[PDB]
Structures are given as C-alpha cells and as structure tokens.
Amino acid sequence: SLNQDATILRQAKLGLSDPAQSLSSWSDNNDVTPCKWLGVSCDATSNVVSVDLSSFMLVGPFPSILCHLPSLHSLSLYNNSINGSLSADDFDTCHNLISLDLSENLLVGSIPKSLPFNLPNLKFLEISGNNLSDTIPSSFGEFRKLESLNLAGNFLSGTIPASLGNVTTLKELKLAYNLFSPSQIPSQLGNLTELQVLWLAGCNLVGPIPPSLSRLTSLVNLDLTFNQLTGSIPSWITQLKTVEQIELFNNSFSGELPESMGNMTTLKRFDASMNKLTGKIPDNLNLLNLESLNLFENMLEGPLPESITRSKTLSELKLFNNRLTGVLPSQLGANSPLQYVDLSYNRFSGEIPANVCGEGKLEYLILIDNSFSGEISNNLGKCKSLTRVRLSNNKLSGQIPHGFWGLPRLSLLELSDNSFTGSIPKTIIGAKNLSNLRISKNRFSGSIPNEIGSLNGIIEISGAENDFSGEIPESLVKLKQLSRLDLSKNQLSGEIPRELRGWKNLNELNLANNHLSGEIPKEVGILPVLNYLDLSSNQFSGEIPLELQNLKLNVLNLSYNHLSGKIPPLYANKIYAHDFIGNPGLCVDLDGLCRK
Ligand SMILES: *[C@@H]1O[C@H](CO)[C@@H](O[C@@H]2O[C@H](CO)[C@@H](O)[C@H](O)[C@H]2NC(C)=O)[C@H](O)[C@H]1NC(C)=O
Ligand SMILES: *[C@@H]1O[C@H](CO)[C@@H](O[C@@H]2O[C@H](CO)[C@@H](O)[C@H](O)[C@H]2NC(C)=O)[C@H](O)[C@H]1NC(C)=O
Ligand SMILES: *[C@@H]1O[C@H](CO)[C@@H](O[C@@H]2O[C@H](CO)[C@@H](O)[C@H](O)[C@H]2NC(C)=O)[C@H](O)[C@H]1NC(C)=O
Ligand SMILES: *[C@@H]1O[C@H](CO)[C@@H](O)[C@H](O)[C@H]1NC(C)=O
Ligand SMILES: *[C@@H]1O[C@H](CO)[C@@H](O)[C@H](O)[C@H]1NC(C)=O
Ligand SMILES: *[C@@H]1O[C@H](CO)[C@@H](O)[C@H](O)[C@H]1NC(C)=O
Ligand SMILES: [Mg+2]
C-alpha cells in the first residue's frame, strides 16, 4: 500500500530529469511515508489519489508509470518540460483518472484518437499551451463525463469537430489560439446546454454565430475574439441571466448593439471593439456590475447615455474611433473608480466632466481629436494617479490647473493644439516620471522654466507655436535622454549653450522662427544621433561650423539668419542651396569664386 505506492512514484521519477530537485522528498532517506512527499496526496487507506507536480521544472516523456498507482484519480504536470509526443499506449492504464492536466509543456504531434476510450472517466482535461498538431479527434465526442476541456494555444488544425456537441456534460469548452482552417462555429455546439465558458478566440471562424447557440442559456463567459464572424450580435446574449463576460473584439460584426443590453445587470466586461457596428449605445443602462466597456473602432453614433453613471464599479471605458457626439454625462467618474478612459477620435463637445478622477484612480485620460471646450478642471490638478494625459486637438482654453504640471506619476502630458494660456510654473519640478511634454500650438507664454532640466527621464520637449520668450535654460543641455527638442515658432532669445555633449541621445533640434542669436556651437556636429537640425529664421551669426559635416541630416535648415563666411564644402551642391538662403553674408565657393 505505502510500499507499492512509494515504488511506483520512484519508478516514475526515474524516467524524468529533475534539474531543480523538486522531487528530493521522494528519494531522500526512505522512511517518511509517501503520503507526505511533495505533490502527493493519499486517501485514508494510504493509497495515492493525486499527484500534483505543477511548476516543478521536470523534463522528459509523459510518466505513464504514475497511472499504475491503483487509486490515482488526479494527475497534474501543469507547467513543466514534459516533451516528445503522446502515444496510444501512454494512457492504456490511466482509465481511473478524473483529472488530467498537461498544460504548459513541450508536447508535439497528434492527440491519440484512442484517448477518450483509455480515459473514459475524465471530468477535466487540459493540454493547453503545447505544440500539438493535426485535428482534434472525432472520438472526443465519446466522453461521457467530461466537464471541462482546454486545448487552447496549440497548433491544432482542420476544423472543430461537430461530435464535441455530443459531450453534453461539458461546462467549459476552451479551444482558443489554434490553427484551424477557416470554418463556421459548428451548429452542434448548441447542444452543449450546460456550457458556462466558450472560448474560441483565434480559431479562424467565419460566418455568423449559429442560431443554435441561443440554447446556451447558462453561458457566463463567451469569448470569440480575433475571428472574422459576421452578421449581428444576437439579442439572446442579453437574456443570459448569469452572463459576466462577452468578448467579441476584432471580428466583422455589423448591425447594432441589441437595445436590451441595458438590463444585463450581471455583466462585468463587454468588448465589441474593432467591428463594424452602427447605431447608438443602448440607453436606459442598468449595468450595475460593469467594470469594463470597450466599443472602440466601430461606427457608433449618438451620445454616451447619462445612465452609464449607474455603473458604480466601472473602471475601463474605451469608446475611441466612433462617431459619438454630445456632451459627456456631467457626473462621469464621480461615483465610479475610473482607471482607463479613452474617448479619442469622436465628436464630443462641452466640458470635460469635472470629477472624472473623483475616486482618485484615473491613470489614462485620452481625449484626442474631439471638440471639448472650456477649461481643465482644478479637480484634475489633484489627480495624483494620472500617468498618461492626451487632450490634443480639442477646443480647450484657459490656464492649466497648477498641480497638473507636477503630478508625480505623469509620464505623457499631451495638450497640443488647443488655446491654453499662462506660463509653465516651477512646480513642474514635481513631475519626476515625465517622459514626453507635448504642448505645441497653444498660447503659452513666459520663459521656459529652469526646473524642466531636473526631470532626468524626459525624452521629448515639444513646444512649438506658442509665445515662449526669454532664453533657452542652460539646464536643458544636461538632459541625457532628450531625443526631441522642438521650440520652433516662439519668441525665444539669447544663445545656444557651447557645451552640448550631455545631449548624447538628441535626434532632433528644432528652434526655427525665434529671435536667437550668437554662433552655432561646434559641438552640434559631435552629437552622435542628431538627424534633424533646424535653426532657420533667427539671428545666428558667424561661421557655420565644419563639424556639421559629420552628421547625416534628414533636415538641415539654416536659412534666414545673419551667418557669414562660406558654406561647408559637403553642402556646396545646388541641391542643398535652399538650406542656406537668406544669409546676406554667406557665400558658396564653386569653380574658384564665392557666389551668393
Ligand atoms: C512555471 O514554473 C516556474 C517555476 O518552475 C515559475 O517560475 C518561478 O516563479 C516565481 C514568480 O512567481 C519566481 O519567484 C521564480 O524565480 C520563478 N522561477 C524560474 C525558474 O523562473 C513560473 O512562475 C511558472 N509559470 C506559471 C505560469 O505559473
Ligand atoms: C513549439 O513551437 C514554438 C513556436 O514556433 C517553437 O519556439 C521557438 O520559435 C522561435 C521563432 O518562432 C525560434 O527562434 C526557436 O527556434 C523556437 N524555440 C526553440 C528551438 O527552443 C518551439 O521550438 C516549439 N517547441 C518544440 C518543443 O518543438
Ligand atoms: C527652411 O525654413 C524656412 C523657415 O524658416 C522655410 O521657409 C518657410 O516655408 C513656408 C512654406 O512651408 C512658408 O509658409 C514660410 O513663409 C517660409 N518662410 C520664409 C521666411 O520664407 C523653408 O521652406 C525651409 N527650407 C527647407 C529647404 O526646408
Ligand atoms: C526531451 O528533452 C530532453 C532535454 O531537453 C532531450 O535530450 C530529449 O531528447 C527530449 N525528448 C524528445 C523526444 O524531444
Ligand atoms: C456524435 O456527433 C455526430 C456529429 O454531430 C452525430 O452524427 C452522432 O450521431 C453523435 N454520436 C453520439 C454517440 O452522440
Ligand atoms: C485581428 O484579428 C485577426 C485574426 O482574425 C489578426 O490576424 C489580426 O492581426 C488582428 N488585429 C488586431 C489589431 O488585433
Ligand atoms: Mg506637441
């Protein structure tokens, strides 16, 4: 009993390599009964009933010998390196198993056609995340007790077999992420009336969801993402009394959201993004359990209904790239833990809801390419959770809230192409995580504050087309990660600093159309990744440094300055000419004579 089982366990272990020594309890000082060995569970008569070797890093062929344990009912080899292929014989003796978990291993080759006959008592079968190939055997329809089947993430091909509809005990059917031929969802899956989980994402499915699936009245999670299903989202999903998740992202669904979607009180997550839906968001929403609503990249029209505010656990709202209109519900966010809000590329208007970050969890506020107007609320100035703000291409105006500039987790601050006014405050010093500052095409004024040069991670400062004045702060020149500096079309004055070697990552320097003066520093030419240099329309004077000829410039523009001497010889050709026009004192040396 303990004798027999210890020996069979040890036999099984001998056919495996165990480089992490996960099974050291099995062969160390024989004495401890096997019942207390790692991964081993016994019944009251001390017979092994369950072997669970999950995540033990074991290598080698399937350990068929474990099946010789007379009371073994559960075997898990989840997340190891069991390798080679499965044979008919591997499972000859495994007929007492109820639970078999071979997920996340290295198995290759076909599923044996004999598997159901050798494992007739199985309730749970998982072989997800391997490299299995060939078709799912039609023999699978012979299982009399199977409750859950997971073959997701293999290379299974052919088409999903119709005989699976015979397995009427199934509650979970997971086939996602295989290499099936393009085909419809088999009609016969409608016969699996107990199903709670149907996961056929990335299955090369075409055609409509079959009308027979309306018989799946117990569905909790329907996930058909990543296919080319067509026609309408059927209205019977709305009558599911226990539905929690509907995932239909990246299909070819057309028509409209069923009107009665509003009464799906149990729904937690709804995604129908990346389809061809038209019509409006259903109104009279009573989505009391909703956590996530994604409907981006469709052709939805009309407003976000006020009733979305009844969803007091809503955290994710992604509606971008539709034709949505009107003002947002003024209370949006006041009573929801909003974390990710992306309403970009629509036609929304009116003010940004003032309590969008009311519960202090908002991380992404993405509103690009709408017609939002008025001011950013001072409330937003205190939203310390914000990491990514994109408010560009709206009709916003006024001063930015003071603390907005120094929020401690803010990474991307994009405000471009609005009508914002004011100076950038010195409290920007607080924005320790700032990577990208994108503020071009506004009416900001004053001097660029010195403290921007303390923000060591900054990779982009983009501030073109404003009213900035004063000097370029010496501090910018020691931002070691700065990639893009664009301050074109302002009223900046003074000089460029001489010592620029701190700009080891600068790719673009654009300072065109300001009132800058002095000489172009020699060290511009020693910058190792500069490919864009625009200093046009300023008052730079003196000679063009010969070191510029080290650079490979996509853009070089020195036009409309007060430069003197000769053009560097590398640029003497007539094709480069427009790069230097409008410098009265400058000439080009060609054929033994200097020419304007
Ligand atoms: C698969 O198994 C390995 C252990 O063999 C797991 O890797 C360990 O996971 C924890 C993280 O929770 C780390 O502290 C260990 O350092 C990891 N070890 C190694 C070798 O990487 C891995 O988490 C398991 N995978 C799953 C999905 O559970
Ligand atoms: C299972 O298939 C995968 C995915 O094709 C193989 O994983 C690697 O695939 C990448 C590129 O697709 C290659 O650079 C490697 O050669 C593959 N990994 C290796 C050789 O370890 C994977 O090899 C397959 N596994 C088995 C056991 O055949
Ligand atoms: C170099 O920069 C100057 C501006 O400093 C460019 O000239 C402007 O070009 C636009 C056309 O897109 C006109 O609207 C402006 O009126 C021009 N400014 C002046 C002062 O004439 C010029 O095109 C750039 N040259 C190259 C080769 O890129
Ligand atoms: C199983 O993996 C080991 C070690 O990585 C290898 O030496 C052995 O030949 C593998 N077996 C098969 C059939 O690939
Ligand atoms: C199994 O399913 C096939 C295909 O739907 C069907 O024709 C066959 O009669 C079914 N057999 C059993 C035993 O249910
Ligand atoms: C959309 O799904 C298809 C499979 O139908 C996939 O090949 C494609 O890359 C996916 N695209 C996106 C953006 O998810
Ligand atoms: Mg910008």
Residue numbers in the entry: 20 to 615
Quoted passage from the original study:
The LRR-RKs HAESA (greek: to adhere to) and HAESA-LIKE 2 (HSL2) redundantly control floral abscission. A receptor protein called HAESA is found on the surface of the cells that surround a future break point on the plant. When its time to shed an organ, a hormone called IDA instructs HAESA to trigger the shedding process. The peptide hormone IDA binds to the HAESA LRR ectodomain.
We next determined crystal structures of the apo HAESA ectodomain and of a HAESA-IDA complex, at 1.74 and 1.86 Å resolution, respectively. HAESA LRRs 16–21 and its C-terminal capping domain undergo a conformational change upon SERK1 binding.
